[PDB]
């Protein structure tokens, strides 16, 4: 029995055009533990993506934080793609800098 990951994409500090930041992708509520996480800039896979160690919570579901350094601009688009057994195809959540 599988659980669908939930995803948040968000900066570490309030976004400010031209200032170095960290973009996070927080993935929770999934099971099994194996999951494939990617961050994309302007449609293209970002290669340098750090991943926290994986944990689980009292309901047994797993969670992990993906993150990459970045400098937001007015037009650059950001996203996080998650591939998980529980979904037929990957899920892409886009960065909304108001959230």
């Amino acid at each position: 029995i599988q659980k669908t990951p939930q995803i948040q994409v968000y900066s570490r500090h309030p976004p400010e055009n031209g200032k170095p930041n960290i973009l996070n992708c927080y993935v929770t509520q999934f099971h099994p533990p194996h999951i494939e996480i990617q961050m994309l800039k302007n449609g293209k896979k970002i290669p340098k993506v750090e991943m926290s160690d994986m944990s689980f919570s009292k309901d047994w579901s797993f969670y992990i934080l993906a993150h990459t350094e970045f400098t937001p601009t007015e037009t650059d688009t950001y996203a996080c793609r998650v591939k998980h057994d529980s979904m037929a195809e990957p899920k892409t959540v886009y960065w909304d800098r108001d959230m």
Binding site: I1, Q2, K3, Q6, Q8, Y10, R12, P14, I22, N24, Y26, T28, H31, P32, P33, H34, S52, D53, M54, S55, F56, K58, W60, S61, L65, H67, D98, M99
Partner: protein
């Protein structure tokens, strides 16, 4: 002071055809990671995850490490065992999880020792509140029940939970207390966003806080906006602090009628704030 806890979260994942099962133990004191053992290494050892644990001598690490390696192989066997209880192919990935620990009160006495297992994300078995008897969650778990009665292990585990588990919790608390007790207040502020037609969105941000527990409310003149207020799950900044927000859709020009209330354990008093058009 409040109550305190020493908890181990343990995972074993089969990956047939891809090597040995991945094995992971995480130790928590007061819900804060302090030791971790990861099987994915050439010389996997128990290691410290909080500065205050580096206080422990090489003897402690060898001992813990040794217990973990033996737990890993015991779970490796458990993986195969359960493949039998459930009549499952030997070719798919399966997961066993365990939560094992003690919670103690301010007095220092047992508040609740315990140990539950999960197979493939579902409750399997669990030591009851009374540290005496088991709750099997299904037919397969019923087997493990006997095997743990005929072999007598629900007392063995009671000793651990009421003795060494408690003694070491104290020990850890004593060394980490100053760091455990660490508190960061949230810095709040309100943001303003458009919306179709004559509505706007007010979003109340709470940033950089710890612990993660927190409460954001919106008020229209001293009533809490219960229904359709939007809020994200509290989330890691990635630097040890957390972020949360809560937002409401309000009439245009009526922003000054709304108040965000931020309740957090580390504030002198709840934060009260409104939209500030600069």
């Amino acid at each position: 002071m409040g109550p305190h806890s020493l908890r181990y979260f343990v995972t074993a994942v089969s990956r047939p055809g891809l090597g040995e099962p991945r094995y992971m133990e995480v130790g928590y004191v007061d819900d804060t990671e302090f030791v971790r053992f990861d099987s994915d290494a050439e010389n996997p050892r128990y290691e410290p995850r909080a500065r205050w644990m580096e206080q422990e001598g090489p003897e402690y690490w060898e001992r813990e490490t040794q217990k973990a390696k033996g737990n890993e192989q015991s779970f490796r066997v458990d993986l195969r065992t359960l493949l039998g209880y459930y009549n499952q192919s030997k070719g798919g990935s399966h997961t066993i999880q365990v939560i094992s620990g003690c919670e103690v009160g301010s007095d220092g006495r047992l508040l609740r020792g315990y140990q539950q297992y999960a197979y493939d994300g579902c409750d399997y078995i669990a030591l009851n509140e009374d540290l005496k008897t088991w709750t099997a969650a299904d037919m397969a778990a019923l087997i493990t029940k006997h095997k743990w009665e005929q072999a007598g292990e629900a007392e063995r585990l009671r000793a651990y939970l009421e003795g060494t588990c408690v003694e070491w919790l104290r020990r850890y608390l004593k060394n980490g207390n100053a760091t455990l007790l660490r508190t960061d207040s949230p810095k709040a502020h309100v943001t303003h966003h458009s919306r179709p037609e004559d509505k706007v969105t007010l979003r109340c941000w709470a940033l950089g806080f710890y612990p993660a527990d927190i409460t954001l409310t919106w008020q229209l003149n001293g009533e809490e906006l219960i229904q359709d207020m939007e809020l994200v799950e509290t989330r890691p900044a990635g630097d040890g602090t957390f972020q949360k927000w809560a937002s409401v859709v309000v009439p245009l020009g009526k922003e000054q009628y709304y108040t965000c209330h931020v309740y957090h354990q580390g504030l002198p008093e709840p934060l009260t704030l409104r939209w500030e058009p600069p």
